[PDB]
Design a binder for this molecule. Structure first.
Ligand code: 9XA
Ligand code: 9XA
Lengths: 275, 275
């Protein structure tokens, strides 16, 4: 059995600690490792929850899972130290229509493929790992716009936005496919799911009755490559019946041919068209 | 203490096992993970050597170190399976002058910076890890041309090309800096060190007498950005006296302002210029 212990980073090695965001999972700050001379992201009793998330990221390491660099566990400070994502989250890419006026299909399809690849790897673990928190904010993008899945605070080993939550989860495994289905809608539409509705309880009511973000020419245009394959995936994805929802392997199976259409350069052109 | 065990991959999960290259470290083939649905690279008492290299890649995980995905240890087959590097090695980028006629300075300097960043991280471990094998073939490049250091077969914990080897090791810590400057010379010159020399034993004699790849207008032109800073770095790097050679921190310190000059887009333009 080949083991590896996650490095322990002393707080004093974390210099230029500027804050980035505060969320349910914790507070994200940008630092700079004193020895490694690289920019780093830092998330910071309630200690057990952080040490669990840190264990998850170390175990669930993959090409599309946020790379944990080490842990800061001191009596004064506790925080998860990971790689810094220059181009933030997918939420920012999709909804900053001023900053990012043009976004290309190759990039949008590359992102969707990568999310499925990461979530599929998690589900192929022994025991499987279920994210249970997938949002466009959790799908991070590196300098070359590649997916890095974050927020493993709610994730569980199979042994306040509710817009990505399946309706069965409301009242007291197929959760991630539901979240993925809303994310796939959101990526293709570039629209916020249930924008019309102000009250979150209305959204919850609507979905528990079978309502889902609208599919039409205004929401998802006909110019969308493989539109029918995509809508089929989205609709089966967010099926009211959990047993009717696909596996991520089936998403991969349906996605693989769509992505073979695009030439390797069109993605690099898409990432430059952005900057 | 947060630990992680390296995954064990059954040989039957490695589909489309096609040959890529054969070297001193082993045979590098390309497969495709049957469950993860991603393309991977797999290298294959000789057992003890591979199991050691695998342990090193799992422990030495960093942004510029080749990501190990798992181990195949069966009575029939033994091999390390890692991430697949689409654009191969630095040796290929530098010497395939037909395929890559124009290679921009921002990219060349980004590569040099990243090599130093990865080797510096190795040296900053506890205990430090010394590569002891750095070659342009070992410096791998991903789809977006970012450095991934490989070949940890000769690497050691501080507790058949000889052109990157310091003269003190020929006849039976400052080794990696020596290799790095030869690499830095090679990146900037785009020429093979000791190209005019036929016999490898002659190279070994010449270097032990203080000879190093030539520095002049033919080898390294004046058009090279920060030519003086670079030559100063290279010269100190391959110093005959090991005690005279710098640390990778000093390389980083000297490199940081040179990379400061290049703007973010020029690198993305440089990578697209190749494809
Ligand atoms: C006003 N702008 C804010 C957003 N811009 C900076 C990039 O932003 C980020 C980078 C980042 N790299 C890694 C993380 C991270 C996320 C999670 N969940 N967990 C861990 Cl351990 C690490 N991360 C988070 C943000 S963040 O927190 O700012 C964002 C709001 C984009 C998620 C531009 C300016
Ligand atoms: C111009 N190109 C000619 C051919 N190219 C394809 C094969 O290129 C490769 C990719 C690769 N990805 C990961 C590895 C690897 C290396 C080591 N050391 N260890 C492990 Cl475990 C894995 N690897 C090796 C080669 S390789 O062996 O063919 C090469 C000679 C390029 C290093 C691409 C473009």
């Amino acid at each position: 059995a080949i083991c590896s212990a996650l490095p322990t980073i002393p707080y004093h090695k974390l210099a230029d600690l500027r804050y980035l965001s505060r969320g349910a999972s914790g507070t994200v700050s940008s630092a700079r490792h004193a020895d490694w001379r690289v920019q780093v992201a830092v998330k910071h009793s309630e200690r057990k929850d952080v040490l669990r998330e840190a264990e998850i990221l170390h175990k669930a390491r993959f090409s599309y899972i946020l790379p944990i660099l080490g842990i800061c566990n001191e009596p004064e400070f506790l925080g998860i130290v990971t790689e810094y994502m220059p181009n933030g989250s997918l939420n920012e890419l999709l909804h900053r229509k001023t900053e990012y006026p043009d976004v290309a299909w190759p990039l949008r399809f590359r992102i969707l493929h990568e999310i499925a690849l990461g979530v599929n790897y998690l589900h192929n673990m022994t025991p499987p790992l279920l994210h249970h928190d997938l949002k466009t904010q959790n799908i991070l993008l590196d300098n070359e716009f590649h997916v890095k899945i974050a927020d493993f605070g709610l994730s569980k080993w199979r042994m306040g936005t509710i817009i990505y939550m399946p309706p069965e989860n409301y009242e007291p495994i197929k959760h991630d496919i539901y979240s993925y289905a809303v994310i796939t809608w959101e990526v293709l539409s570039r629209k916020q799911p249930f924008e019309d509705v102000t009250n979150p309880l209305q959204i919850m009511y609507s979905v528990s009755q079978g309502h889902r973000p609208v599919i039409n020419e205004e929401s998802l245009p006909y110019d969308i490559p493989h539109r029918a394959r995509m809508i089929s995936l989205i609709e089966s994805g967010w099926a009211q019946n959990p047993d009717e929802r696909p596996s991520f392997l089936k998403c991969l199976i349906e996605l693989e041919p769509v992505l073979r259409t695009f030439e390797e350069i069109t993605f690099l052109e898409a990432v430059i068209q952005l900057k």
